[PDB]
């Protein structure tokens, strides 16, 4: 209903140290993504290596 | 009121169940010989009865305990050669025997030497003697031990034909007395064959 | 069987194991010698810098003098010791680890006297030297016996065991360092040495029992 | 109670799906609440909003080291199999973690130092405790046999729990000598604790969810050659 | 036959999975932050000392890969490259040293961009860092091979063994280390780092017949 | 006209001649055996023959030339297996064959590893095989090579009964076509002794 910010990216998005806080947020993304993608896949890929082996 | 025995041994490489129950007891006086196969476990079922190696169901009964319990009462009474000689390659073939006797040195290790089969190699390093008088250094110990167990893996490697006929002559004696001999050979032992205890991996 | 007797045959087996166990020893010498010419004739930054050159060479001579713990063991006697031997396993890493540092400890702490000399350090310098790396040495081999317990078989040497033994090495580096310099400006230093001695102690009673625990794990 | 069978593949499947659900709903209001709703600070002005990423992330980059060494002292006076394979299954998000802590100080500290690197005992702590992972994951992607490669790793997290203390201790005390002083004081704000009692609470949800589909993963990666998986 | 394929080889036997690729990396940023821990915190200290760190790494690197250079291959495969493989044997041992570098050059040149950042090295600082640790670290292998296959390959070896593997790498740290201080004080390196590539061609060319020597007399 | 013909052999190694005056000639299609006992210079003699080492007094003639002058057209008609396999011991046995093969296949090799007996064991790291096996995969470079001579020492190290026949049957069709086999085998063959040249180490 009210925040502590004011008005769009123009606002938001620029605290004055942008750079250093949204550097901060993707590298902590992207990692946490990676981290992800890669459990997922490799739960997939261990069903594909069986298959493989089911011959 | 047997000495060491086994307790529904069983290991897995994790492809195949090599042995699968194994129970079998050694009285004092007997000849065994681990019959298999290549690709048995042969090795592992014997560093499982040496101790170095963890059973993965079952255990290992010496003499009334397991080999946890009692794992300085048990070192005493054991004689492991496995395939890997045991000797540090650098020292003289002396200086090895020197190490692995108690008392009473320098003066029956020469004779456990000699006895072997490596009358005039004993000063000479053991990286300069050969691939089958590597092995004699670490066999030559069956001269000297006084142990009441003897857990030998592959102890024909590559001994010479005159040396075998010595090795089964020496054994015939310590599993005459009170000895306990665990073979695990591919050459057909020339000893009568009504006297070793076959046991398979079962 | 024996302690002793092992301790012996350690020490026999390594006179053997000659030109290896000589080369962590030029290594600590190069490193020592190269950094006074890199920085040229500067009195006071190389009066600064050599309480840490000096530990950081030591500490890496030991790593590169550890690699031969255990290793040439495992492809043959390795066993014959947790086999045989009544004697407890933690007593014979303890007489591993102690031939270790009569191997690679003490030649590093004879020459400390000419390390001083070339160095420029005072009396009372090498004083502080020689006392930190009595106390160093051996808790850096207790600190490397579990690493190379654990490292011998698998034979992926230097980069893996540095990085097991080296992170565990941080608080004798600094503790060491902090006491030598110290003595720069001759202010009394004892309770620098008693973290040296209480560290020594607690990685002398808890390190046989896990490079025990280790050379189990590695030999199955 | 407890008698491990291959059920655990089917125990942690069922608490996968509602612990990942659940884990971004308490994520995305301890950064939703916080990161646009909590005020920030005199001295740092609108940058002293990297809480949310750095100590989250601090927290729980000990936080799992210190549940490692349970996963090992289980799996190793008590000698179990699937515990011991819970250390090389926390072993690569506490790396995560404390590589992201490394990079959110830098980024933090960056207004404020004047560059990147500056060596601090809250930071140096955190670079050795990658370290002491990287140990761990290395180890263990070394052994060509299973069921060896988690005890050594159970010895290790053993032996590097025995050390973190004194490291942590040391390094505080190697701040002490040189710098002489600390960076910023401990206070928090009252209308900004309960926004980062948020996220860490988010960020302990996602280490379980993670660690849970990572020992998914290991189970099969050990138990491949059994009838079980014919499904 | 096919030196492409004993390349690979190497390759292989390094790096059995891809999650090892990084274990040089991280031990190379261990060695690295391990000398501010003993030094301290400022920056511009460290910003003169950075030769030096980076070279002692590197040497320490290269010791440590000449190990399992040739004595892991003595024990049992080494006289199959020597009978069998119809190509030469320079050829044999080149494409070892040359998997060497890329298990000890190559993650230092990966990691060059980070280490002269941490210690506190300018742009200058980097360009002649990366044109002195990719010019001058495999000539630490090519020298280093020769003394490291009798070192480790001849049985009954004195003490005297020593001096063919580290004091010959010697005038190398002194032209290397003496290099990058010019970009300390900002001008061109030119001559002091164009007799680094004299130093390779002349020791690319004469290092692997000498290796093939040291093998064949040790052999024999 | 004729392989190797080493002429006045000699070795003085420590301070005893192992063989002097030790002048034979291998024609084409030769099984030949160095008969010796366990501490003659068999292993030396075997390392005199395939270059590795150098003799004290006269010369090996391969093909009418020395030895060390061509070494070029004779490591790719030559296959010596000594005491130690030669393989590495982290590889899969797989991988060891696709690199001692000429043309890297991975066809071949697989009917390799499964006419020596490693039927199954193609991806299993050869350390975690046992110690009979390790050396099979080393012989199982048998089918696979075309090198029209072998000297292979101590072949018949750790090798059941069906392996040992399994490579005497493989090397009685090398030595008819055109193949020359050399061996030093402590157990002696079971084919009769009139298709053998016995070479005594004098
Ligand atoms: C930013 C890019 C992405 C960040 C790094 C993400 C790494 C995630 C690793 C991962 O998911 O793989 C896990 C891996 C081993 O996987 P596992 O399943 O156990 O093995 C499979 C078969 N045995 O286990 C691992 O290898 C774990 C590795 C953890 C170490 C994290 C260190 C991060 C390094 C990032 C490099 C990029 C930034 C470099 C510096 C930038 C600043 C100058
Ligand atoms: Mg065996
Ligand atoms: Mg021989």
């Known amino acids: 209903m009210t925040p502590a910010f004011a008005s769009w990216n123009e606002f938001f998005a620029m605290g004055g140290y942008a750079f250093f806080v949204w550097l901060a947020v993707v590298m902590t993304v992207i990692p946490l993504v990676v981290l992800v993608v890669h459990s997922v896949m490799q739960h997939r890929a261990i069903l594909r290596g069986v298959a493989q082996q089911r011959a | ?130 691939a089958g008088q590597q092995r004699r250094v670490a066999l030559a110990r069956l001269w000297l031990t006084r142990a009441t167990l003897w857990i030998l893996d592959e102890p024909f490697t590559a001994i010479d034909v005159n040396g075998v006929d010595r090795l089964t002559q020496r054994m015939a004696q310590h599993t005459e007395q009170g000895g306990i001999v665990i073979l695990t050979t591919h050459q057909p032992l020339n000893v009568a064959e009504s006297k070793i205890r076959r046991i398979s991996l079962t | 069987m024996m302690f002793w007797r092992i301790f012996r045959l350690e020490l026999r087996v390594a006179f053997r194991h000659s030109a290896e166990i000589a080369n962590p020893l030029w290594f600590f010498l190069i490193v020592i010698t190269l950094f006074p010419l890199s920085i040229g004739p500067e009195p006071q930054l190389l009066a600064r810098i050599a309480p840490g050159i000096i530990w950081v060479a030591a500490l890496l001579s030991s790593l590169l003098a550890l690699e031969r713990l255990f290793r040439d063991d495992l492809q043959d006697g390795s066993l014959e010791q947790l086999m045989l031997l009544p004697l407890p396993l933690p007593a014979v890493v303890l007489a591993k680890v102690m031939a270790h540092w009569m191997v690679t400890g003490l030649p590093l702490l004879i020459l400390s006297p000419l390390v001083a000399m070339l160095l420029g350090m005072d009396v009372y310098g090498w004083q502080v030297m020689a006392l930190t790396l009595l106390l160093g040495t051996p808790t850096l ?55 040296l001695g209480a560290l020594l102690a607690g990685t002398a009673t808890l390190s046989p029992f896990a490079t025990a625990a280790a050379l189990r794990i590695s030999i199955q | 109670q407890l008698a491990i069978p291959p059920r655990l593949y089917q125990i942690c499947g069922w608490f996968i799906p509602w612990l990942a659900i659940a884990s971004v709903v308490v994520l995305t209001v301890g950064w939703i609440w916080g990161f646009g709703f909590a005020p920030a600070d005199y001295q740092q002005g609108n940058s002293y909003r990297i809480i949310y990423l750095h100590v989250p992330a601090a927290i729980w980059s000990m936080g799992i080291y210190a549940s490692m060494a349970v996963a090992a002292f289980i799996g190793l006076v008590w000698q179990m199999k699937m515990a011991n394979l819970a250390v090389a299954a926390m072993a690569p998000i506490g790396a995560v973690f404390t590589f992201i802590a490394l990079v959110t100080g830098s980024a933090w500290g960056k207004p404020m130092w004047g560059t990147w690197w500056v060596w601090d005992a809250r930071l140096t702590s955190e670079l050795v405790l990658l370290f002491l992972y990287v140990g761990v994951i290395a180890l263990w992607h070394a052994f060509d046999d299973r069921r060896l490669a988690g005890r050594a790793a159970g010895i290790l997290v053993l032996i590097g729990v025995v050390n973190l203390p004194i490291i942590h201790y040391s390094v505080e005390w190697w701040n002490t000598l040189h710098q002489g002083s600390t960076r910023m004081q401990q206070s928090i704000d009252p209308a900004m604790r309960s926004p980062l009692r948020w996220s860490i609470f988010g960020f302990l949800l996602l280490s379980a969810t993670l660690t849970l589909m990572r020992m998914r993963n290991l189970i099969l990666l050990m138990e491949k050659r059994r009838p079980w998986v014919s499904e």
Not at chain 2, 6 to 26: H, K, V
């Open chain 3, 141 to 195: 081999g207790f600190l490397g016996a579990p690493g190379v317990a654990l490292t011998v078989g698998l034979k992926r040497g230097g980069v893996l065991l540095s990085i097991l033994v080296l992170p565990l090495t941080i608080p004798l580096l600094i503790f060491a360092t902090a006491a030598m310099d110290a003595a720069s400006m001759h202010l009394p230093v004892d309770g620098y040495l008693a973290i």
């Open chain 2, 1 to 130: 009121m047997g000495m060491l025995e086994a307790r529904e041994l069983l290991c897995e490489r994790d492809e195949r169940t090599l042995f699968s129950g194994l129970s079998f007891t050694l009285n004092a006086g007997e000849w065994v010989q681990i019959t298999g196969s290549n690709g048995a476990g042969k090795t592992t079922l014997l560093r499982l009865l040496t101790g170095l190696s963890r059973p993965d169901a079952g255990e290992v009964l010496w003499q009334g305990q397991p080999l946890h319990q009692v794992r300085d009462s048990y070192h005493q009474n054991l004689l492991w050669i496995g395939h890997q000689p045991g000797i540090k390659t650098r020292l003289t073939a002396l200086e090895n025997l020197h190490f692995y006797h108690r008392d009473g040195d320098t003066a029956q290790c020469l004779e456990a030497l000699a006895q072997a089969g490596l009358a005039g190699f004993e000063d000479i390093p053991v990286n300069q003697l050969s």
